[PDB]
Ligand binder design. Structure first.
Ligand SMILES: CCCCCCCC
Ligand SMILES: CCCCCCCC
Ligand SMILES: CCCCCCCC
Ligand SMILES: CCCCCCCC
Ligand SMILES: CCCCCC
Ligand SMILES: CCCCC
Ligand SMILES: CCCCC
Lengths: 283, 258
């Protein structure tokens, strides 16, 4: 409805046209399993193309619908363990408390955090408490919204340094089929995204980002046209002539196949082009 | 409706929001007779100038006579013959310039000779265009202009690539029966030289009109047009430089219609 999204989720539809539906240089085979209403199992097997690094993950997710509890745990072949607990709507008027934790061998990740969010008709507030060993920090999210107009501010205060290390503003406007968003980070990093839905299934997205002094200019355009109710086709170009193609097709009620390819328009002949494959079985 | 415009007229609706409604640093005295009497007076050059035009109409037989005498005593002869040798075929001998062009339901053809060649194709609001300029004295093309866009009554998008070096774009929008909004963008490939600008034309009443531009160079443009009397439209304009507010050499103009 009119509930404003989180600061990290505004301008998401334009971002999903660029990201969703593309698998580059990866052989992704996932299997989803929902045996009961709450329990969900998901094991994935990916193989890198450039480095030939096979990575297999195992995720167990259970949902407690009555008490609002939500448990999420992830496992990986690299022993990169992650756990998340989400309590939603336990307190009055749409509250949510989340406990995240990620552990990794030798990479130096022993981080865990406590997230806190508040939602209403026009206000969306977020509070994070990262416990990184290098230094704890508090993240504050504030999003204003009324009549399709959005306004957001994000702040991260690092207690180890006793100062705010990042302060991001965001102003945007969105409709049912049109979304315009503007982002400025630390006064020097700027950005903007325009989401447009042309037809019943034609999503048009334009992304623009640059730094202070007309530097690091990066712009592009993406599209997500479907030809069939079961087939999705995606294409995107940027100023570096990187052309990304993607074709998503579900072959049967529980099988999904995704073909994708990245082409370097600068050097077509041996320019480091990438092919990707994605199989998602439903069970 | 379905007929496409020429290459010089595609994306004109968004351009009219920027161009029309402004007489900067100029006292343009205009008189419309149904004939064109326009007298331009620069406030900085201080050189009174006035040009006149006459047009004889023969609509039943399909010919027109045109002759214009400018201030600096230069005159140009121009005659056009259209819809005779073929439906939509239009010839023009201006000055001495020979202009030929074909206009149909989905194609706008044009071959100017003084050579310029343009072609515009249209289908369901989608427009493709390409124009070239071939210099016979240089034995090489000097301009290669390509454009493509999508046109609708309330929204118009237009892109431009001239000589493969400079890119451009324009957006037209009509959010109300009296409010308009146009966006402009142009830049050169391989360079940070960008040119971004937005304008609007608000119409308070059928006799009043207000316009406003702004540029990334902090060039603020304002314009108010009123029709206090039937047959006399007074338009006021002022150019404001945001870079030099004090002693910046700002330009204001005044236009009268009759
Ligand atoms: C419109 C808000 C201005 C943002 C200034 C940037 C300071 C971090
Ligand atoms: C609306 C587009 C703004 C472009 C900013 C200039 C990029 C260097
Ligand atoms: C319209 C896209 C052109 C990209 C060129 C920018 C780098 C020269
Ligand atoms: C909407 C595309 C704007 C690109 C500007 C690039 C300036 C170097
Ligand atoms: C009006 C309720 C919002 C409270 C923010 C601290
Ligand atoms: C909305 C708070 C801004 C702090 C810089
Ligand atoms: C609703 C039509 C939008 C075309 C860009």
């Amino acid at each position: 409805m009119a509930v404003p999204p989180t600061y990290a989720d505004l301008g998401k539809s334009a971002r999903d046209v660029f990201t969703k539906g593309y698998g580059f240089g990866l052989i992704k085979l996932d299997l989803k399993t929902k045996s009961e209403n709450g329990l969900e199992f998901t094991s994935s097997g990916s193989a890198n193309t450039e480095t030939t690094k096979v990575t297999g993950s195992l995720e167990t997710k259970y949902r407690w619908t009555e008490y609002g509890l939500t448990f999420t745990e992830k496992w990986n072949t690299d022993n990169t363990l992650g756990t998340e607990i989400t309590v939603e709507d336990q307190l009055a008027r749409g509250l949510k408390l989340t406990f995240d934790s990620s552990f990794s061998p030798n990479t130096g990740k022993k981080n865990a955090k406590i997230k806190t969010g508040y939602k209403r008709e026009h206000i969306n507030l977020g509070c994070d408490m990262d416990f990184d060993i290098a230094g704890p920090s508090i993240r504050g999210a504030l999003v204003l919204g009324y009549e399709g107009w959005l306004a957001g501010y994000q702040m991260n205060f690092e207690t180890a340094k006793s100062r705010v290390t990042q302060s991001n503003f965001a102003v945007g406007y969105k409709t049912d089929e049109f979304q315009l968003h503007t982002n400025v980070n630390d006064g020097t990093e700027f950005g903007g995204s325009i989401y447009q839905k042309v037809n019943k299934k034609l999503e048009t997205a334009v992304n623009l980002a640059w730094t202070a002094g007309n530097s690091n200019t990066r712009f592009g355009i993406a599209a997500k046209y479907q030809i069939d109710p079961d087939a999705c086709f995606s294409a995107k170009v940027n100023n570096s002539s990187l052309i990304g193609l993607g074709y998503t097709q579900t072959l049967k009620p529980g099988i999904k196949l995704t073909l994708s390819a990245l082409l370097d328009g600068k050097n077509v002949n041996a320019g480091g082009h990438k092919l990707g494959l994605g199989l998602e079985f439903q069970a």
